[model samples]
Target: MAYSEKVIDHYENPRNVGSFDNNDENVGSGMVGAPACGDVMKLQIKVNDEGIIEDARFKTYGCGSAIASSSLVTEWVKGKSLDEAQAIKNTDIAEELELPPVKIHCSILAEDAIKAAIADYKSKREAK
Candidate 1:
């Protein structure tokens, strides 16, 4: 089946698909891999001095839908609190892009990336 228009849009013009700083203090980086496919995705969030998510960036080694899912979250997670972004659901992402049921896994990975990144962020500050 063909990808939804939004998926194609984000794939063509991915948002916040930039390089994240390496194991930095203010950046929380998370990564995941597909069950069978060789797909891997890494997402990062930068918390500002205000203790809120400043921006997100990511890189996904997968299908167009996977990259689209990651790119969309970078846009959504920006300006959201850490907990709020943690509340982000794969359902919203699947519905927002009208992705196929089979491709829902891509959205699931996106949410996981967000939640895991937030934990990484929380973990860093705990050591302070």
Candidate 2:
């Protein structure tokens, strides 16, 4: 296949395709972009009382791979504790999505997006 099955599945009908309030204490937001096609992604997570990723959503200005990467990351992060989610790697996303060399950055962006959001939550939680 030109693209992996999972990639196209999420790309065609992406889940968690919206936004939440970044200002909300329980919410964390991450924005990242790449030069390719002016691709950008905004990812957000809602933390529960115990700091589990209760929910997550993503908006990607990407090629299909980036769209699928963001969507897949959203699905992976939910139900994971902050640290659990934070520990995820680009390689995991890469392998899972079967990303090729040209689109490798797509998975990297997804990893960074998750890490960025997780850090946002941590900083927000401790700030006040």
Candidate 3:
């Protein structure tokens, strides 16, 4: 398959390509799937008490665009406040990843994964 140069970069030399302790109390995790694209992405973040994302990671099973999008967000969300991470939108990720219009949903999937992970973390935290 032919991928854009950016896509190839991320796929071959992906950023934040790893996993963290999602079970940790300080972590927030989000997993999302898109039947439309037949893609699945999971994002995990370790938030410090001060609310900065201390670290991030992801696992993706999909096209190169999807993997690249998730990998990009895992790097972008870290070192950012949870609120900032929450503020991230699919457009930003798509633009950064330079996703083609047809592949925009890949970015959407990544954004949703981030939001879901953050929400999951927040909800779990508040439940305590």
lDDT of 2 by residue, 1-128 (tens): 58665533343443445665444678887887774667567888889888889888888654554435447877899888879987899899889878679988877788778888888988888866
* Worst 10-residue lDDT window, candidate 3: 7-16
Q: Which pairs clash in the backbone of model 2?
A: none
Off by over 4 Å in 2: 1-17, 20-24, 35-39, 62-69
Stretches > 4 Å off in candidate 1:
1-24, 37-39, 62-69
TM-score of model 3 vs. true structure = 0.73
Better of 1 and 2 by TM-score: 1
**Candidate 1 local Cα displacement, residue 54, angstroms:** 0.4
**Cα shift from native, residue 70, model 1 (Å):** 3.8
For residues 78-123, write the lDDT of model 1, one tens digit per residue: 9998989978888998899787888878878788888888998888
TM-score of each: 0.74, 0.73, 0.73
Worst 10 residues of 1 by lDDT: 7-16
Q: Would you list the clashing residue pairs of candidate 3?
A: 29-117, 30-117
Candidate 3 lDDT at 108 equals: 76
Q: Measured by C-alpha RMSD in angstroms, how accurate is candidate 3? A: 10.2
The runs of at least 3 residues in candidate 3 whose Cα sits more than 4 Å from the true structure, single-residue gaps closed, are 1-18, 35-39, 62-69
